[PDB]
RNA sequence: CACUCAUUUCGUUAAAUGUUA
RNA sequence: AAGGUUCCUAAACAACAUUACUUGGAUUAGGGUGAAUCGAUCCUAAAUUACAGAUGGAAAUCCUUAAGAAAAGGAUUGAAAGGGAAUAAGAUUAAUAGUUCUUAAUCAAGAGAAAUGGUAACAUAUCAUGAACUUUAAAAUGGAGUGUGAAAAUCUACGGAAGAGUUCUCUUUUCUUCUUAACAAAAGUAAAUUCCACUGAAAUGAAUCAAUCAGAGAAGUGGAAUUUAUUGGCUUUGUAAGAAAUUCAAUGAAUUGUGGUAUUUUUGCAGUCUUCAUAAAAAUUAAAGGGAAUCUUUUGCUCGUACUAAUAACCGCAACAGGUCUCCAAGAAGCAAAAUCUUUAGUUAAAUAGAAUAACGCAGGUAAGGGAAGUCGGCAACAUAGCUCUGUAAGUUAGCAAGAAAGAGUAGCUCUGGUGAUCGAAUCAGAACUUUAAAGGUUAGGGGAAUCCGACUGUUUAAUAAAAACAUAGCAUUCUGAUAAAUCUAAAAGGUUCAUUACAGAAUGUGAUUUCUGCCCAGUGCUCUG
RNA sequence: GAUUCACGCAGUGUUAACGUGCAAAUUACUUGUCAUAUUUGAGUAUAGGGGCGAAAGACUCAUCGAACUAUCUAGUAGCUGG
């Protein structure tokens, strides 16, 4: 597992076709966008709800998205 | 301590099974069999061991090919 | 305290059977397997440990980057800077001495 | 031992297979004298020596 | 009777040399053209402790006379040799400590070591700690020279026999008194199995010719002929003299 | 601290007065420092029997068993030097 | 007595031996 | 390792486990052992064995790279404790699990005229070519003792959340949980060591527990590198809370701070000491010198894997008080991993019991007065015993004797003082008062005066002898120049000391140190340059 | 190759227990020793007129002043028994 640091690199990950799945985990303070790629699982810790919504919109519609909360699937 | 006590450390095999004669007579460190006289090409037989000759010799086994050749 | 067991079937505390007992989830402790401590590179002349090269197992040098297993200098990774500096002075001063002593003195 | 050669394990399995009694139907054959297998052994009674 | 310990030593089962950590064979380089008619230069890279022998060994590196590469040697270090030194082997080598010269090039009175008994056999005599041979005289009529062995005997060798100039390092090793049986035990760590020596008188008649009776005594003269068979050749053999000499 | 048994005090009372006195002289020389012949620093220390290493100067020298240079090897060095002069000059 | 040619003991990567130039 | 199905379940109890058994390691029938990452496989060690050759009447022996038209250099085997490419957490089964499942990784083998920066030490998500050949380094190296970095466990300070225990006597109380992997990241920040630049130290400085270091250049200032149980040591971050732990409700909800100049274990590091001891190799990997030539995806074969590992699974005829190699390791108390008691875990069964309370026993004790008078002999038992202070003789190899011998003190409670850093450590000293006057529950030297033997540490007759016997260091003698001495073999380009070379190899006697080794060469040996 | 305690090991004494034993050599207490001439596993080497032995004729699979096993062998017996 690797972590992307700022908002720019994460977008290029969803823009690229290498993506396989996306899981969004909402915590009591932040929300993590975990992009399941071929080799690694990249994650972005978004602490701003406004920028979280922007990242949710940028997800391609043909990919599976899992929304996680206090209860795991 | 040469009796009961000294037998506690006996957990290393001198002999294992032999590939040619099937008996637990293959000396590991000597690398030869004490019963059939392995890698030696000739089977180990002695005239003083008359019983050992009648325990493993011709006719003591299946005789898979020779049982047909002689009767033919 | 929590007592542990070996995971592999090596029952003796040899050099390759080093372990570390670390804490895991729920309070129980698991057994790791720790690497052996390795030496580094030495200068071929003075036998001093070379700088800029990590002390890892020999097969792990292949995994490193190209620049991480040498120094960007002549005889880098086999000779110290003091080892090299004397090689340069030996080469130049002996040849210069031969030029004047012999070779049309 | 846990560690063993492949052919040694198969000879251990054969000794397990041979440690069985006469089946019931065999005992009802006419002119039958084989009721108990006398080549039987147990781990705590006789060591098979291999 | 039984077989004495001297007989059991010749089979070499537990009495084999404990030569596992030894550096190697210490000798001169094989004689070639460049050392018969010229000189080669060798660098003393390091000085090491060879297990089982009292003198240090030198790792000399000659470059190569004919091919490309190195020629790693292993000399018996002469006293005064140091790391990084240049030593020379050859007929025209200078008379300096550590150089290897033919014995005929050494002036009379020269002190040499690691002398060859036969030319090209890579050193025989004067190889233990602090030991040396002295050149006595030369004889150009038959190309032979006379040297004095460390035991005092004189030997006549071919003039082209090779030797190293100087003293073998490590002298005075035997002048230090061993004090403990443990120290003597460690001395034979890289040597044969000989140390704890049971006296023959302390044995039984089956074990030894000295194996005594009710009193620990030999009973017969201890000076024996050289023609005594093994198993009875115990004591002093062909003793010309005997006792505290005056 | 001790009147006369200085370094052989580690032996206690169990090897004889003379044997302790003979080895006392050797052990003092064996564990002493010597002047480096190349850099003149009192830094040469024995590592193994016959091997003397010069600490702050980086030289390995072959020498005596318990001293840097034996008296027998000292005369030999002077003997060879004198013999070489005679050969060089006539 | 002189030699080597069987014979002995060796050494090497059988790596400039012997005679001229 | 050894055993070999003893493992798990169900039915069943004739025999077996010195009574009995509904129990069982016993009877019957089924079930059970899942690997690219753990091992074997691979490499070599001591050593072992081939073809050809050498030797032998023979069987066969020798040689292992020397003898060879064999093998760029030398063949086979030899380690489940040595070397070694790469996997972790949680869950799961009646039983297997670094092996299955979930999630997340890693490794190997594949497929899709040749760069910059820094003065320098040296540094740049592949970058930025690098053949033959050669070299270097790694794999890969004893032990002791001291100091110290980090982690874990234990203890503890602050702040709580949740549950439990005691509670007519108190106790803002006692207890339990508050966790997190492989592999990677790089907010913040360490200890140690080695180098580099500036400058040039004497009125000599720098420093350590100890040392040790400096004009072949100290200290100071500023830098570079490496080590610290994976990336980069620690906190922190991704994995990752969605797991797990502790609770509550009837699947759903709650929480999961921060510290310590404390002890122990583990793991590194730094210098010190010690050797007539210097304390493996190969597979395999990287770098250098040289300058010839011009992100996605696939696969990962074979074998072991159950169970015991012992007061019942092993070896002793057995469920034998015997023997048998290791890993992890809580509290009290103490110098202590001692004796004693307890927590987690395991167990209450381990060749049957009940009544009675004779003799004589086996094991454990006590005793008036006397105190070895017993006895071959203080055998056995008693006795002394921890710590602090005072004190300690003859003799002596001057090191010791020595814990000599001998004497005084020691409890509980209430206080004071000393030993540090910019709040904390148990340690030491002293002073009041009280008592049954204090090491003693457990643990825990009896001492002195002589003589004999062996100098000392050590070894020995497994199963009646542990010693004065053997060894030992010291001393002394003998032979030997290596084609030798000793010596194995029937023989041998055969073998051992010998990878050796007189400060060595081989054969002997006496047995540390001090003092001394007297006279005898007729006899028997040995020797002669006759 | 100092003195001691502990984990371990041994075997000084009781000439204790037991002596048709827990045991074809063990148990208890006392005692000694308890890392460098130390302890110990696995691998490996040495074989019967041989090996190995800090030496006791000790050890070499409960067998050692010459192992075990088989053959010569139904060895011979002026001696004992029937």
């Amino acid at each position: 597992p690797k972590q992307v640091q700022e908002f720019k690199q994460i977008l290029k990950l969803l823009k690229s076709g290498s993506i396989r799945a996306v899981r969004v985990k909402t915590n009591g303070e932040n929300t993590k966008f975990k992009v399941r790629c071929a080799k690694y699982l990249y994650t972005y810790i978004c602490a701003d709800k406004a920028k979280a919504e922007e990242l949710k919109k940028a997800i391609p519609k043909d990919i599976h998205v899992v929304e996680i909360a206090k209860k795991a699937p | 301590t040469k009796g009961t006590s000294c037998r506690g450390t006996r957990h290393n095999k001198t002999h294992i099974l032999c590939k040619r004669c099937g008996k637990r007579s293959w000396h590991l460190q000597k690398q030869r069999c004490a019963s059939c006289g392995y890698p030696d090409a000739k089977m180990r037989q002695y005239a003083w061991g008359y019983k050992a000759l009648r325990r493993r010799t011709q006719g003591t086994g299946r005789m898979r090919h020779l049982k047909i050749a002689l009767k033919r | 305290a929590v007592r542990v067991t070996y995971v592999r079937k090596h029952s003796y505390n040899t050099k390759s059977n080093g372990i570390r007992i670390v804490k895991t989830a729920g309070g129980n402790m698991t057994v790791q397997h720790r690497q052996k401590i390795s030496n580094g590179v030495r200068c071929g002349d003075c036998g001093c440990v070379l700088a800029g090269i990590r002390h890892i197992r020999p097969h792990q040098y292949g995994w490193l980057g190209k620049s991480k297993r040498t120094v960007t200098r002549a005889y880098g990774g086999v000779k110290c800077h003091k080892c090299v500096q004397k090689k340069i002075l030996r080469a130049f001063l002996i040849n210069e001495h031969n030029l004047i002593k012999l070779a049309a003195a | 031992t846990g560690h063993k050669g492949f052919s040694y394990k198969l000879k251990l399995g054969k000794k397990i297979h041979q440690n069985r009694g006469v089946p019931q139907w065999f005992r009802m054959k006419t002119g039958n004298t084989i009721n108990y297998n006398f080549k039987r052994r147990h781990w705590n009674r006789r060591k098979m020596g291999m | 009777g039984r077989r004495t310990l001297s007989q059991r030593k010749g089979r070499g089962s537990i009495f084999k040399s404990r030569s596992h950590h030894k550096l190697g064979v210490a000798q001169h380089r094989a004689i070639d053209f460049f050392e018969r008619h010229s000189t080669v230069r060798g660098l003393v890279k390091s000085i090491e402790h060879d297990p089982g022998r009292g003198a240090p060994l030198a790792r000399v590196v000659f470059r190569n006379p004919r091919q490309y590469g190195l020629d790693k040697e292993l000399f018996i270090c002469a006293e005064g040799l140091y790391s990084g030194q240049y030593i020379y082997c050859g007929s025209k080598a200078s008379l300096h400590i550590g150089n290897v010269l033919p014995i005929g090039q050494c002036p009379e009175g020269t002190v040499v070591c690691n002398v060859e008994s036969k030319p090209g056999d890579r050193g025989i005599i004067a190889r233990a700690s602090g030991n040396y041979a002295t050149v006595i005289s030369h004889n150009a009529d038959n190309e032979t020279t006379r040297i004095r062995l460390p035991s005092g005997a004189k030997k006549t060798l071919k003039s082209n026999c090779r030797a190293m100039v100087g003293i073998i390092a490590g002298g005075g090793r035997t002048e230090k008194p061993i004090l403990k049986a443990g120290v003597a035990y460690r001395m034979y760590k890289a040597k044969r199995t000989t140390w704890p020596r049971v006296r023959g008188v302390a044995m039984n008649p089956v074990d030894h010719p000295h194996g005594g009776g009710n009193h620990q005594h030999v009973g017969h003269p201890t000076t024996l002929k050289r023609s005594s068979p093994p198993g009875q050749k115990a004591g002093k053999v062909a003793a010309r003299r005997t006792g505290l000499i005056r | 601290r001790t009147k006369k048994v200085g370094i052989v005090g580690k032996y206690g009372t169990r090897y004889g007065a003379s044997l302790r006195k003979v080895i006392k002289k050797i052990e003092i020389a064996q564990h002493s420092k010597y002047v480096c012949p190349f850099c003149c620093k009192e830094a040469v220390r024995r590592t193994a029997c016959g091997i003397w290493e010069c600490k702050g100067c980086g030289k390995q020298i072959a020498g005596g068993a318990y001293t840097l240079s034996t008296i027998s090897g000292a005369t030999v060095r002077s003997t060879v030097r004198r013999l070489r002069d005679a050969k060089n000059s006539q």
Side-chain angles (χ1 to χ4, degrees):
Chain A
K2 326 211 89 85
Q3 183 187 346
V4 312
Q5 297 301 334
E6 40 263 8
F7 201 87
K8 286 67 56 177
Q9 300 121 297
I10 194 78
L11 273 303
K12 293 189 41 212
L13 205 41
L14 312 78
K15 295 326 147 60
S16 84
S18 65
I19 207 162
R20 189 178 291 172
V22 166
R23 25 190 124 167
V24 190
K25 167 97 179 93
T26 85
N27 294 314
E29 167 155 307
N30 58 61
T31 165
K32 293 181 175 176
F33 296 68
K34 327 198 182 183
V35 166
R36 171 79 244 173
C37 282
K39 219 203 169 168
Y40 301 109
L41 166 79
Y42 297 95
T43 166
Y44 175 68
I45 310 187
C46 187
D48 209 74
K49 295 318 84 163
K51 320 215 295 181
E53 307 319 301
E54 171 49 58
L55 263 173
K56 294 199 105 285
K57 246 58 72 193
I59 311 199
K61 261 52 69 188
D62 59 326
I63 212 55
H64 188 221
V65 165
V66 194
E67 262 269 38
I68 322 159
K70 250 308 195 176
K71 304 246 61 182
Chain B
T1 79
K2 51 165 115 153
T4 290
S5 267
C6 78
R7 317 229 178 282
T9 343
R10 308 181 65 246
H11 56 89
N12 290 298
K13 290 163 169 165
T14 287
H15 291 104
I16 57 145
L17 284 183
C18 186
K19 187 205 215 181
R20 179 160 89 180
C21 39
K23 294 181 75 170
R24 195 177 79 163
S25 292
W26 172 267
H27 202 284
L28 281 170
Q29 286 179 259
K30 276 181 207 181
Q31 296 172 100
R32 82 184 305 282
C33 178
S35 202
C36 46
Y38 201 14
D40 312 0
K42 294 215 187 195
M43 271 255 179
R44 156 186 180 284
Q45 291 167 117
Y46 292 109
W48 47 258
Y50 65 101
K51 291 205 204 215
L53 298 213
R54 71 193 190 191
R55 287 202 258 265
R56 185 185 59 230
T57 188
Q58 204 183 88
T60 53
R62 200 216 274 219
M63 267 203 115
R64 185 186 324 207
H65 162 96
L66 206 32
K67 94 207 311 179
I68 300 155
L70 300 196
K71 106 190 172 93
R72 141 167 46 181
Chain C
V2 185
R3 296 174 277 183
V4 299
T5 46
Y6 275 142
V7 191
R8 320 173 177 209
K9 293 322 170 78
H10 321 303
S11 35
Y12 307 106
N13 184 35
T14 39
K15 224 72 65 183
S16 57
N17 205 13
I19 56 137
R20 180 185 195 164
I21 305 147
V22 300
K23 223 165 49 176
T24 321
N28 40 38
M29 291 221 263
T30 197
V31 154
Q32 304 205 121
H33 166 263
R34 69 155 191 282
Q35 245 168 104
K36 298 201 269 186
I37 302 278
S38 313
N39 318 104
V41 195
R42 308 231 169 204
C43 173
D45 307 3
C46 68
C48 91
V49 164
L50 301 194
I53 309 140
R54 291 206 44 217
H55 303 14
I56 50 186
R57 295 270 116 182
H59 68 92
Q60 293 176 319
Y61 279 107
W63 309 343
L64 273 181
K66 191 66 203 75
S67 80
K68 308 269 306 185
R69 37 208 193 196
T70 165
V71 190
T72 326
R73 195 210 320 111
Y75 296 84
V78 306
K79 257 87 192 159
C80 70
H81 64 291
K82 301 214 216 95
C83 319
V84 160
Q85 227 151 359
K86 296 200 207 95
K87 284 169 102 84
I88 298 161
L89 286 172
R90 265 195 279 278
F92 164 73
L93 289 174
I94 289 169
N95 301 346
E96 208 86 338
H97 200 63
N98 295 337
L99 228 50
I100 277 183
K101 169 197 87 233
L102 283 150
Chain D
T1 45
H3 304 133
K4 35 175 89 89
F6 167 62
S7 40
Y8 185 53
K9 183 184 142 158
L10 263 41
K11 297 206 172 37
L12 293 184
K14 180 148 189 62
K15 292 320 211 76
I16 276 149
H17 192 65
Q18 296 183 335
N19 223 34
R20 302 180 70 137
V22 199
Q24 178 48 48
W25 60 266
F26 199 90
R27 293 217 282 280
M28 276 134 39
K29 276 168 152 225
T30 66
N32 193 232
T33 48
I34 306 179
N35 295 299
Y36 308 105
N37 185 9
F38 58 64
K39 296 197 189 194
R40 264 194 104 166
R41 45 152 268 279
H42 214 48
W43 62 281
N44 65 345
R45 274 319 157 241
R46 185 200 79 97
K47 296 312 189 175
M48 54 211 214
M50 53 138 69
Chain E
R2 255 210 210 84
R3 280 207 194 169
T4 62
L5 173 65
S6 34
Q7 305 197 247
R8 299 204 285 108
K9 266 159 146 134
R11 321 170 58 248
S13 76
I14 52 149
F15 311 94
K16 273 172 313 168
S17 182
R18 299 166 185 157
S19 69
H20 187 248
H21 296 287
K22 307 220 159 129
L23 307 197
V25 189
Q27 62 210 347
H28 308 316
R29 28 176 274 134
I31 179 88
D32 58 301
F33 162 86
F34 290 86
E35 203 184 323
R36 285 188 293 251
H37 297 113
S38 172
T39 174
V40 284
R41 178 176 93 180
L43 171 73
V44 188
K45 276 289 294 277
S46 98
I47 292 167
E48 321 231 346
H49 161 95
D50 187 10
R53 103 199 294 142
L57 253 52
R59 287 202 183 282
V60 192
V61 175
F62 303 80
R63 185 67 174 69
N64 221 18
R66 54 205 96 97
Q67 232 155 7
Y68 177 77
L70 276 193
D71 256 4
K72 276 164 252 189
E73 282 312 313
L74 192 67
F75 288 1
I76 301 190
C77 221
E79 167 146 348
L81 253 69
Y82 60 98
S83 270
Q85 191 191 7
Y86 286 138
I87 69 176
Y88 300 85
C89 311
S91 37
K92 330 295 306 158
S94 41
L95 195 74
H96 285 86
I97 296 281
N99 290 20
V100 185
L101 279 90
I103 214 60
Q105 246 55 78
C106 308
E108 323 66 52
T110 318
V111 165
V112 288
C113 59
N114 212 2
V115 196
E116 294 188 326
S117 77
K118 232 197 301 189
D121 88 320
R122 329 259 292 273
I124 286 303
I125 325 166
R127 287 167 56 100
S129 308
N131 270 122
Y132 67 95
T134 322
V135 167
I136 292 298
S137 71
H138 293 284
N139 194 345
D141 320 330
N142 39 323
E143 305 268 43
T144 216
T145 89
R146 275 245 296 192
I147 64 151
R148 207 212 318 283
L149 306 188
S151 57
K154 321 271 207 73
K155 195 158 193 185
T156 287
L157 310 165
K158 319 286 270 215
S159 92
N160 40 327
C161 270
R162 278 176 315 164
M164 157 151 41
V165 184
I167 291 317
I168 305 277
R173 198 210 340 127
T174 50
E175 273 82 306
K176 170 168 175 181
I178 314 141
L179 289 179
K180 325 181 225 164
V183 174
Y185 168 86
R186 307 279 201 166
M187 161 184 329
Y188 304 101
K189 189 225 183 156
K191 291 195 141 203
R192 72 230 55 107
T193 298
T194 39
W195 170 52
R197 195 194 85 75
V198 184
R199 289 161 308 128
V201 293
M203 301 161 189
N204 281 311
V206 57
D207 304 293
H208 206 251
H210 292 3
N214 297 0
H215 280 95
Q216 267 191 25
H217 74 310
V218 184
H220 49 89
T222 54
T223 46
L224 313 179
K225 286 184 139 300
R226 178 97 62 198
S227 60
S228 319
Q232 102 168 21
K233 204 189 267 142
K236 316 160 208 318
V237 178
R240 302 174 255 280
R241 236 212 69 105
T242 279
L244 195 60
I245 322 98
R246 301 303 205 159
Chain F
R1 210 128 66 176
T2 61
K3 306 303 120 192
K4 65 211 208 60
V5 169
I7 195 182
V8 279
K10 81 217 183 156
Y11 295 132
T13 89
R14 63 184 156 263
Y15 292 115
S18 315
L19 280 181
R20 296 199 317 267
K21 185 178 156 105
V22 166
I23 204 154
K24 155 151 183 189
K25 224 191 93 86
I26 270 169
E27 301 215 281
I28 281 156
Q30 170 184 350
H31 299 125
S32 56
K33 320 177 176 190
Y34 292 105
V35 167
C36 215
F38 311 103
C39 38
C40 292
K41 282 181 120 100
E42 170 113 359
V44 171
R45 251 168 311 276
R46 200 191 83 153
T47 87
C49 172
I51 319 176
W52 297 81
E53 170 125 26
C54 187
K55 192 181 131 88
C57 180
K59 287 270 179 189
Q60 222 173 8
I61 310 144
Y66 313 117
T67 53
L68 179 53
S69 43
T70 36
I71 84 191
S72 165
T75 77
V76 163
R77 180 167 279 284
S78 80
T79 281
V80 152
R81 190 204 49 247
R82 160 193 100 237
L83 279 196
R84 160 171 78 250
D85 304 332
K87 199 157 154 178
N88 268 353
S89 95
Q90 315 142 29

